[PDB]
């Protein structure tokens, strides 16, 4: 017989299987549609999520009852040192799908990306790309042969970048290598753009800008094996329930004589690839720019790092992106920021954000001071020596 009481399903069937991700760097499964009139730019960037903080700004949207008033919003800051372009991959079109036809690498690879090709770096002879580097030796004719194939064929062109994780307070020592599609220009311009940027960095201000919607692509935070109450949001059973109450009472009817794929069952929670869209950029900050955290309204010569540092990450000494709200994944986690796949004109987009204040009070407690000079002025001179 019927349920006797209708209710919506628990959990989303399109986010299955709730299994661990294949890689800790979530892959980009779609790039924006290419219009070849614009110059050759990157379609996404790589970053390390540093943490979250607080802003104040004036809302600019008529109709709202907080129009022209100071609203408080949560932002997340991601550490984005420039990516080093070290390769290019041509993709031919085929009645089975895109297919890499060939790849060309820069003649010099840093050790931070050479480490990516090693499981045991410290024992090896470090032989990676040593014979390939002799293809530029005489005059680089063989390299020019491969680049010409990408120009002739390869209707889709993607570039290879690796992070400068040395300039980051991670213990990792090993950079993250990824493919980023090149939009703008035709195939020849895309190949020429890749060739001219070999061994050269690409700043985040050239691919991103303030007030535009970008998407986050990261693996979420792992939680291990989890029961059905916190994995699917199913009702806890009554207190009187014998042999367990954090369960699903009926896991199926008699017929079909099987457990269904759509029944909530215990398993892995978190560490799933997720792609969240429509994160407005609130600030594109710069590394060699003291007063990162200052705005037009603060003028306090302070960076974006909270007082005492970002908890579990460190200080931000490089450039950064600062998007509204929360993105998937935790601190220290490699995140891919991608430009919007469609043009958003919501009026929640298209609106210019001017920050009025950035929080730098410590996130290691109830931080009550924005800067050490502010703490010194309020609290006075202490017993601790100078």
């Amino acid at each position: 017989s019927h349920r006797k009481y209708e209710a919506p399903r628990h959990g989303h069937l399109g986010f299955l299987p709730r299994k661990r991700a294949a890689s800790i760097r979530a892959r980009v499964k779609a790039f924006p549609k290419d219009d070849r009139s614009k110059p050759v730019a990157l379609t996404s960037f790589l970053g390390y999520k540093a943490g979250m903080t607080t802003i104040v700004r004036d809302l600019d949207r008529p109709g709202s009852k907080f129009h022209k008033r100071e609203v408080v919003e949560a932002v997340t800051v991601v550490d984005t040192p420039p990516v080093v372009v070290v390769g290019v991959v041509g993709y031919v079109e085929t009645p089975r799908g895109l297919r890499s036809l060939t790849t060309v690498w820069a003649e010099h690879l840093s050790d931070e990306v050479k480490r990516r090709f090693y499981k045991n770096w410290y024992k090896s002879k470090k032989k990676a790309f040593t014979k390939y580097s002799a293809k530029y030796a005489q005059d680089g004719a063989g390299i020019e042969r491969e680049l010409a194939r990408i120009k002739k064929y390869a209707s889709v062109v993607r570039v290879l970048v690796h992070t400068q994780i040395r300039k980051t307070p991670l213990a990792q020592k090993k950079a993250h290598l990824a493919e980023i599609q090149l939009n703008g220009g035709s195939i020849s311009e895309k190949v020429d753009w890749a060739r001219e940027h070999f061994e050269k960095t690409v700043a985040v201000d050239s691919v991103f800008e303030q007030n535009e919607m970008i998407d986050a692509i990261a693996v979420t935070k792992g939680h291990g094996f989890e029961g059905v109450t916190h994995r699917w949001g199913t009702k806890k059973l009554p207190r009187k329930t014998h042999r367990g109450l954090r369960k699903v009472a009926c896991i199926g009817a008699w017929h079909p004589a099987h457990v269904m794929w759509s029944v909530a069952r215990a398993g892995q929670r978190g560490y799933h690839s997720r792609t969240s869209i429509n994160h407005k950029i609130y600030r594109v900050g710069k590394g060699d720019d003291e007063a990162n955290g200052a705005t037009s309204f603060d003028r306090t010569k302070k960076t974006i790092t909270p007082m005492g540092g970002f908890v579990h990450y460190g200080e931000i000494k490089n450039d950064f992106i600062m998007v509204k709200g929360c993105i998937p994944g935790n601190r220290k986690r490699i995140v891919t920021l991608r430009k919007s796949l469609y043009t958003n004109t919501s009026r929640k987009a298209l609106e210019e954000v001017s920050l009025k204040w950035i929080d730098t009070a410590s996130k290691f407690g109830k931080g009550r001071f924005q800067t050490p000079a502010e703490k010194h002025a309020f609290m006075g001179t202490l017993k601790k020596d100078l």
């Binding site: 079109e93 085929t94 009645p95 089975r96 079909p256 099987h258 457990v259 269904m260 794929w261």
Partner: protein
């Protein structure tokens, strides 16, 4: 009577070409089918689209990954019609189906190879004129095949390369058939004319 027989899928009826190919493989003939997107089915497009939707909705209820698979490509729709005409669960049927290659478009090496047709499967020979028919390119795309425009760009590319092959072959056929025509009214020619050659 050829070691590998290559059928051009264009203009054929899917089931009658599947009946011939099934019996051809079971008799030990290797068969390659090309341009499976121009295969045809009798009946109007909407009617055949409904028949695929009835096929799409049947799946294992407790696990969709193990149920009937619903292949989108027109080469695999045709292959789905070959199975069901072949005892595919036996090792003889497995060895038969190994003698089959089905393709979209005409890939190498079959681009420069001779293609045949099956007159009992040809729609222009089989269908009553005025009766509607479905093309396997439109049907497959309408149910989720993603490579109609890719095959079309490569098929038109091959036709350009093949039309200008036939251009110089016409010129060479002209030269050969001229010297043979002059070789007539000769002594050797009139003897072969009595012997029928």
């Amino acid at each position: 009577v050829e070691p590998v027989v290559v059928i051009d899928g264009k203009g054929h009826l899917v089931g009658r070409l599947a009946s011939v190919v099934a019996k051809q493989l079971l008799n030990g003939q290797k068969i390659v089918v090309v341009r499976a997107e121009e295969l045809n089915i009798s009946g109007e497009f909407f009617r055949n689209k409904l028949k695929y939707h009835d096929f799409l909705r049947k799946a294992t209820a407790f696990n969709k990954t193990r149920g009937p698979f619903h292949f989108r490509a027109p080469s695999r729709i045709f292959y789905k019609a070959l199975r069901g005409m072949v005892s595919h669960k036996t090792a003889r049927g497995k060895a038969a189906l190994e003698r089959l290659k089905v393709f979209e478009g005409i890939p190498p090496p079959y681009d420069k190879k001779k293609r045949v047709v099956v007159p009992q499967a040809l729609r222009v020979l089989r269908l009553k004129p005025g009766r509607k028919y479905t093309t396997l390119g439109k049907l497959s795309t309408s149910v989720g095949w993603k490579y109609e425009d890719v095959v079309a760009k490569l098929e038109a590319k091959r036709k350009v390369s093949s039309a200008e092959y036939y251009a110089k072959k016409r010129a060479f056929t002209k030269k050969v058939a001229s010297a043979n025509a002059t070789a007539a009214e000769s002594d050797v020619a009139k003897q072969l004319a009595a012997l029928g050659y």
